[PDB]
Amino acid sequence: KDKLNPPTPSIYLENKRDAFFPPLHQFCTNPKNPVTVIRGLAGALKLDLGLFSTKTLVEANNEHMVEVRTQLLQPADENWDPTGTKKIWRCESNRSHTTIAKYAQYQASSFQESLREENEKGPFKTIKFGTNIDLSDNKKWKLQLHELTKLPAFARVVSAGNLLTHVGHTILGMNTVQLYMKVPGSRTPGHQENNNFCSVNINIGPGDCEWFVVPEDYWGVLNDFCEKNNLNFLMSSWWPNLEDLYEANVPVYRFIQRPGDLVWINAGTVHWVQAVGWCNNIAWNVGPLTACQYKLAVERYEWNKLKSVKSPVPMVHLSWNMARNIKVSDPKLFEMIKYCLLKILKQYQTLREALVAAGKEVIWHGRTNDEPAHYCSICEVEVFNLLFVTNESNTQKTYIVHCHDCARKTSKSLENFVVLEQYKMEDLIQVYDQFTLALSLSS
Ligand SMILES: O=C(O)CCNc1cc(N2CCc3ccccc3CC2)nc(-c2ccccn2)n1
Ligand SMILES: [Fe+2]
Ligand SMILES: [Zn+2]
């Protein structure tokens, strides 16, 4: 069908007025739009993309680390097995490190080589993709990060309407900017974002990228394809065969992102990308305050536990911060948060009471103000409030956190552990009790 090749939701911007017009924000965060391409965004805001050019990056921080992915240059929208015999999803890629200076030299020489060749099944040539360049340090990237404060609020790295701002600590690559340096054929394999959070991606240019997008509600079909073909959906590198998807009645959105175009990847949207030319891209996550975002983040948080994968967004910690600090006025979002908090509060009460009835002391430990969420050092599950720490780590004040189950598996009666409490019961009950739906007259 044509229903399987739907048009891309696309907003065409001319000026600042268009960029700050509230229907834009609403269009991006509408769950019916799996992706939104905001064309002409950088030009409309007079954003200086030059601050993210390879030449500028090399001058700024020439020894900055780059995670190199070495890949094969595959034809068009396809992915062939090493031998060029059949199309497959798997596309593993070896990792190494280099610096911005060294990668720049390669990106530039690759272009010169192409010019010289233009004046002259596979097997395929090898290319290198410069990935995951960490732009978190404001003292190294001051002008770069400042330029991105010119965006409308809903798309910024930091804003009051961004759940990731309410986490209250850094989640590298989500509430900090990552940069990608590309040559033609550089591929971002298929995935969903961490905990299904929206992503913002700006192409710096000078060349284009081609994007492939599948709506969130078809992710199970792709997960099933992965399980059938011995791939881990979450953790392996795969490039979907478009003929498999068409045969499975999965719609695929496909489009070109030109320099200065902003791509909004909506919550839980499955996507993959290839560079058509030589370009750089910048990206980060945003978590709009909508029922759909919160729900999908919680679903993936729980799915991650079943798949034994760490959630980079600590959804327990975040939910308590939301209750302390955000006046929520959408009834649907409100009820989801309230439901989650009650579950958390009740499981904590059940556990705390079992510990006390077993004669185990609970030690008042408290918390530092900007202290991150904790995860179990063994199984990597988020641990909230009651921290299980060995007698030795407690004495040494390293406070290495375990969850209850992992502690119990190590030390049957918890004789090797102390139990540390970061929040008083009465304080958590109050935050819950005082978290009520705020009235807003708007839709
Ligand atoms: O191509 C762009 O402009 C966007 C790149 N986006 C990426 C890029 C990226 N990587 C670079 C591409 C790549 C190439 C080859 C193998 C693996 C990977 C994954 C890491 N990883 C992720 C990622 C990872 C975990 C959760 C959410 N997102 N996203
Ligand atoms: Fe990503
Ligand atoms: Zn554990």
Numbering used by the authors: 880 to 999, 1023 to 1345
What does the paper say about this structure?
KDM6A (UTX) and KDM6B (JMJD3) are KDM6 subfamily members that catalyze demethylation of Nϵ-methylated histone 3 lysine 27 (H3K27), a mark important for transcriptional repression. Despite reports stating that UTY(KDM6C) is inactive as a KDM, we demonstrate by biochemical studies, employing MS and NMR, that UTY(KDM6C) is an active KDM. Crystallographic analyses reveal that the UTY(KDM6C) active site is highly conserved with those of KDM6B and KDM6A. UTY(KDM6C) catalyzes demethylation of H3K27 peptides in vitro, analogously to KDM6B and KDM6A, but with reduced activity, due to point substitutions involved in substrate binding.
Recently a small molecule inhibitor of KDM6A/B, GSK-J1, has been described. To ascertain whether UTY(KDM6C) showed an inhibitor profile similar to those of the other KDM6 subfamily members, a set of nine known KDM inhibitors were selected, and the response of KDM6A, UTY(KDM6C), and KDM6B to them (at 10 μm) was assessed, by measuring inhibition of demethylation of an H3K27Me3 peptide. All three KDMs displayed similar inhibition profiles, and, as anticipated, given its similarity to KDM6A, inhibition of UTY(KDM6C) activity by GSK-J1 was observed. GSK-J1 was the most potent inhibitor of KDM6B, KDM6A, and UTY(KDM6C) of the nine inhibitors tested. A structure of UTY(KDM6C) with GSK-J1 reveals that GSK-J1 is bound to the 2OG binding site identically within error to that observed with KDM6B·GSK-J1 complex; the propanoic acid of GSK-J1 is positioned to hydrogen-bond with Asn1103, Lys1084, and Thr1090, and the phenyl ring of the terahydrobenzazepine, as in the KDM6B·GSK-J1 complex, is sandwiched in a hydrophobic cleft between Arg948 and Pro1091. The pyridyl-pyrimidine biaryl heterocyclic GSK-J1 ring system is positioned to make bidentate interactions with the iron, and similarly to KDM6B, it translocates the iron ∼2.4 Å away from the HXE … H triad. Such metal movement has been observed with other 2OG oxygenases with certain iron-chelating inhibitors and may, in some circumstances, reflect potent inhibition. Further, crystal structures of the JmjC and Zn(II) domains of UTY(KDM6C) demonstrate that binding to both 2OG and the inhibitor, GSK-J1, displays identical structure to KDM6A/B. UTY(KDM6C) activity is also inhibited by small molecule probes developed as KDM6B inhibitors.
